[PDB]
Amino acid sequence: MIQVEENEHIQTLVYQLNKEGKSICGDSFFMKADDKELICAVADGLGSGSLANESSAAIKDLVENYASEDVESIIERCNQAMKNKRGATASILKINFEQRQFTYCSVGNVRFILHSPSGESFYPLPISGYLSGKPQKYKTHTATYEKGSKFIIHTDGLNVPDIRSHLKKGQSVEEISNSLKMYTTSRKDDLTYILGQLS
Ligand SMILES: [Mn+2]
Ligand SMILES: [Mn+2]
């Protein structure tokens, strides 16, 4: 699955492929870009298939409903929703286009990498564990981005230690997605990523 969108402020590409033998993806995502802001979330439900999806899809729906809240408030709602489910790992990203400011919060092995034209990257270590309904302390990062910055958020089905090289070399999200194709052909796990190129 590929979905491409653009507006004045961002061009995006979402890619998803199910684990081998599965009809429903255990990963979910939500994204909405308008004239003012981006909300982007990617979640990996524990395990795969329908029961993983029960968890990640609940997160998708909460992010859609509560998109206007801050990232820490949204992620805690997601955590609470995991109480009677398998649970999930997740990342939530909000971008204010006018301020060129992003805010990011995550739990578990969903990765975010932001690459700037200054050749400096933000690629925070994943936070351990998963959203299970149990109390969490959350880490939020807030920063300005340079015009032309690019990012990826990806589930652990995508294993790319040299991701920053791909972001730096590629001149568009389409090119970067094509350069990642080699990592999608195994279907060992659900695999989801969102690429963005910011104006
Ligand atoms: Mn999973
Ligand atoms: Mn996974």
GROMACS .gro file of C-alpha atoms and ligand atoms in nm:
model
  201
    1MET     CA    1   0.000   0.000   0.000
    2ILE     CA    2   0.127   0.351  -0.095
    3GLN     CA    3  -0.049   0.683  -0.027
    4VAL     CA    4   0.097   1.018  -0.146
    5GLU     CA    5  -0.030   1.365  -0.049
    6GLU     CA    6   0.098   1.721  -0.069
    7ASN     CA    7   0.011   2.076   0.022
    8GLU     CA    8   0.213   2.401   0.048
    9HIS     CA    9   0.380   2.286   0.369
   10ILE     CA   10   0.455   1.915   0.331
   11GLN     CA   11   0.469   1.625   0.088
   12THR     CA   12   0.414   1.281   0.237
   13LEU     CA   13   0.424   0.915   0.145
   14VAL     CA   14   0.279   0.634   0.356
   15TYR     CA   15   0.381   0.274   0.289
   16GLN     CA   16   0.239  -0.038   0.453
   17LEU     CA   17   0.271  -0.412   0.397
   18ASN     CA   18   0.131  -0.690   0.613
   19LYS     CA   19   0.331  -0.968   0.768
   20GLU     CA   20   0.337  -1.284   0.557
   21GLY     CA   21   0.006  -1.471   0.567
   22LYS     CA   22  -0.195  -1.190   0.727
   23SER     CA   23  -0.495  -1.009   0.576
   24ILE     CA   24  -0.518  -0.736   0.840
   25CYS     CA   25  -0.221  -0.529   0.951
   26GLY     CA   26  -0.120  -0.520   1.315
   27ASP     CA   27   0.027  -0.173   1.254
   28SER     CA   28  -0.199   0.133   1.214
   29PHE     CA   29  -0.143   0.496   1.126
   30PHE     CA   30  -0.328   0.824   1.124
   31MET     CA   31  -0.225   1.137   0.940
   32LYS     CA   32  -0.389   1.470   0.861
   33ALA     CA   33  -0.217   1.770   0.706
   34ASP     CA   34  -0.404   2.095   0.659
   35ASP     CA   35  -0.307   2.460   0.608
   36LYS     CA   36  -0.192   2.496   0.966
   37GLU     CA   37  -0.064   2.168   1.105
   38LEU     CA   38   0.028   1.804   1.071
   39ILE     CA   39  -0.081   1.525   1.303
   40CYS     CA   40   0.094   1.195   1.235
   41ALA     CA   41   0.080   0.875   1.441
   42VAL     CA   42   0.210   0.526   1.380
   43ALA     CA   43   0.128   0.233   1.609
   44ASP     CA   44   0.239  -0.129   1.620
   45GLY     CA   45  -0.006  -0.354   1.805
   46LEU     CA   46   0.157  -0.636   1.997
   47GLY     CA   47   0.187  -0.946   1.779
   48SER     CA   48   0.027  -0.932   1.436
   49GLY     CA   49  -0.306  -0.977   1.262
   50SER     CA   50  -0.649  -0.902   1.400
   51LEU     CA   51  -0.558  -0.888   1.769
   52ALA     CA   52  -0.265  -0.653   1.709
   53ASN     CA   53  -0.497  -0.443   1.495
   54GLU     CA   54  -0.752  -0.423   1.781
   55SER     CA   55  -0.490  -0.226   1.974
   56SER     CA   56  -0.331  -0.015   1.700
   57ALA     CA   57  -0.665   0.075   1.538
   58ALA     CA   58  -0.795   0.205   1.874
   59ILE     CA   59  -0.491   0.434   1.883
   60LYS     CA   60  -0.553   0.550   1.526
   61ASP     CA   61  -0.909   0.649   1.621
   62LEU     CA   62  -0.804   0.835   1.937
   63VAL     CA   63  -0.538   1.032   1.753
   64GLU     CA   64  -0.798   1.135   1.494
   65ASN     CA   65  -1.045   1.248   1.764
   66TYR     CA   66  -0.798   1.421   1.996
   67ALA     CA   67  -0.554   1.554   1.733
   68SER     CA   68  -0.576   1.911   1.866
   69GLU     CA   69  -0.447   1.814   2.212
   70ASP     CA   70  -0.076   1.808   2.288
   71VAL     CA   71   0.117   1.491   2.209
   72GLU     CA   72   0.154   1.380   2.571
   73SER     CA   73  -0.220   1.411   2.633
   74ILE     CA   74  -0.297   1.211   2.320
   75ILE     CA   75  -0.048   0.933   2.400
   76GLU     CA   76  -0.185   0.895   2.753
   77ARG     CA   77  -0.538   0.852   2.615
   78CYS     CA   78  -0.389   0.582   2.390
   79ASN     CA   79  -0.230   0.416   2.690
   80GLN     CA   80  -0.560   0.409   2.879
   81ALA     CA   81  -0.733   0.248   2.580
   82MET     CA   82  -0.484  -0.043   2.598
   83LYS     CA   83  -0.609  -0.164   2.940
   84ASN     CA   84  -0.821  -0.452   2.811
   85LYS     CA   85  -0.628  -0.518   2.487
   86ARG     CA   86  -0.289  -0.659   2.386
   87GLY     CA   87  -0.133  -0.313   2.381
   88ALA     CA   88   0.086  -0.134   2.130
   89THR     CA   89   0.400   0.067   2.070
   90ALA     CA   90   0.344   0.411   1.916
   91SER     CA   91   0.480   0.744   1.801
   92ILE     CA   92   0.289   1.071   1.778
   93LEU     CA   93   0.418   1.373   1.587
   94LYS     CA   94   0.259   1.718   1.562
   95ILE     CA   95   0.391   1.996   1.340
   96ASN     CA   96   0.293   2.361   1.339
   97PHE     CA   97   0.375   2.484   0.989
   98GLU     CA   98   0.375   2.859   1.058
   99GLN     CA   99   0.615   2.822   1.353
  100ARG     CA  100   0.803   2.537   1.182
  101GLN     CA  101   0.783   2.366   1.523
  102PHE     CA  102   0.741   1.995   1.588
  103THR     CA  103   0.649   1.803   1.900
  104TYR     CA  104   0.717   1.431   1.938
  105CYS     CA  105   0.633   1.160   2.192
  106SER     CA  106   0.678   0.785   2.165
  107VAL     CA  107   0.677   0.456   2.355
  108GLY     CA  108   0.835   0.137   2.222
  109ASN     CA  109   1.022   0.050   1.904
  110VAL     CA  110   0.856   0.290   1.660
  111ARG     CA  111   1.134   0.518   1.531
  112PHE     CA  112   1.144   0.881   1.422
  113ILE     CA  113   1.433   1.034   1.231
  114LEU     CA  114   1.437   1.397   1.120
  115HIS     CA  115   1.709   1.506   0.877
  116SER     CA  116   1.788   1.875   0.819
  117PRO     CA  117   1.967   2.052   0.531
  118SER     CA  118   2.227   2.144   0.797
  119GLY     CA  119   2.316   1.770   0.787
  120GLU     CA  120   2.214   1.731   1.149
  121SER     CA  121   1.972   1.461   1.249
  122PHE     CA  122   1.737   1.404   1.537
  123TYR     CA  123   1.698   1.031   1.592
  124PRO     CA  124   1.605   0.967   1.952
  125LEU     CA  125   1.653   0.626   2.108
  126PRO     CA  126   1.325   0.442   2.145
  127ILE     CA  127   1.164   0.438   2.491
  128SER     CA  128   1.140   0.080   2.628
  129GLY     CA  129   0.818  -0.110   2.684
  130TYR     CA  130   0.475  -0.063   2.533
  131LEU     CA  131   0.145   0.116   2.599
  132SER     CA  132  -0.025  -0.135   2.827
  133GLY     CA  133  -0.257   0.083   3.037
  134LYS     CA  134  -0.004   0.102   3.322
  135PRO     CA  135   0.127   0.445   3.437
  136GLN     CA  136   0.397   0.599   3.218
  137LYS     CA  137   0.619   0.901   3.239
  138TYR     CA  138   0.643   1.045   2.887
  139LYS     CA  139   0.930   1.228   2.721
  140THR     CA  140   0.832   1.501   2.475
  141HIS     CA  141   1.069   1.672   2.236
  142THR     CA  142   0.984   2.019   2.103
  143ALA     CA  143   1.202   2.191   1.840
  144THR     CA  144   1.214   2.414   1.535
  145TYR     CA  145   1.291   2.255   1.200
  146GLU     CA  146   1.485   2.405   0.915
  147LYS     CA  147   1.304   2.457   0.581
  148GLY     CA  148   1.352   2.148   0.366
  149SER     CA  149   1.383   1.903   0.657
  150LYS     CA  150   1.270   1.547   0.587
  151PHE     CA  151   1.159   1.276   0.826
  152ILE     CA  152   1.052   0.917   0.857
  153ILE     CA  153   0.846   0.742   1.122
  154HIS     CA  154   0.857   0.362   1.095
  155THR     CA  155   0.758   0.046   1.271
  156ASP     CA  156   1.008  -0.223   1.357
  157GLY     CA  157   0.912  -0.422   1.047
  158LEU     CA  158   1.146  -0.179   0.870
  159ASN     CA  159   1.504  -0.248   0.974
  160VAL     CA  160   1.736   0.022   0.831
  161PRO     CA  161   2.035   0.123   1.046
  162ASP     CA  162   2.166   0.352   0.770
  163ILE     CA  163   1.831   0.537   0.735
  164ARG     CA  164   1.997   0.880   0.772
  165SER     CA  165   2.199   0.817   0.453
  166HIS     CA  166   1.872   0.746   0.264
  167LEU     CA  167   1.716   1.068   0.389
  168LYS     CA  168   2.021   1.274   0.303
  169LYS     CA  169   2.076   1.130  -0.046
  170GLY     CA  170   1.716   1.121  -0.170
  171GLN     CA  171   1.570   1.435  -0.322
  172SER     CA  172   1.202   1.346  -0.272
  173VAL     CA  173   0.987   1.116  -0.063
  174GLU     CA  174   0.921   0.905  -0.375
  175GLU     CA  175   1.295   0.857  -0.432
  176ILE     CA  176   1.355   0.772  -0.067
  177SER     CA  177   1.069   0.523  -0.067
  178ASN     CA  178   1.215   0.359  -0.380
  179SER     CA  179   1.557   0.339  -0.213
  180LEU     CA  180   1.395   0.151   0.080
  181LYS     CA  181   1.223  -0.110  -0.139
  182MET     CA  182   1.490  -0.370  -0.070
  183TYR     CA  183   1.378  -0.371   0.297
  184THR     CA  184   1.012  -0.446   0.222
  185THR     CA  185   1.043  -0.773   0.028
  186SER     CA  186   1.057  -1.017   0.318
  187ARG     CA  187   0.721  -0.971   0.501
  188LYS     CA  188   0.878  -1.101   0.823
  189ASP     CA  189   0.666  -0.851   1.016
  190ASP     CA  190   0.407  -0.583   0.952
  191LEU     CA  191   0.592  -0.289   0.802
  192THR     CA  192   0.469   0.073   0.807
  193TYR     CA  193   0.647   0.399   0.739
  194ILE     CA  194   0.559   0.761   0.677
  195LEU     CA  195   0.799   0.990   0.493
  196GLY     CA  196   0.760   1.365   0.498
  197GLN     CA  197   0.938   1.648   0.321
  198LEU     CA  198   0.874   1.982   0.489
  199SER     CA  199   0.873   2.319   0.313
  200MN      MN  200   0.292  -0.588   1.590
  201MN      MN  201   0.626  -0.495   1.458
   0.00000   0.00000   0.00000
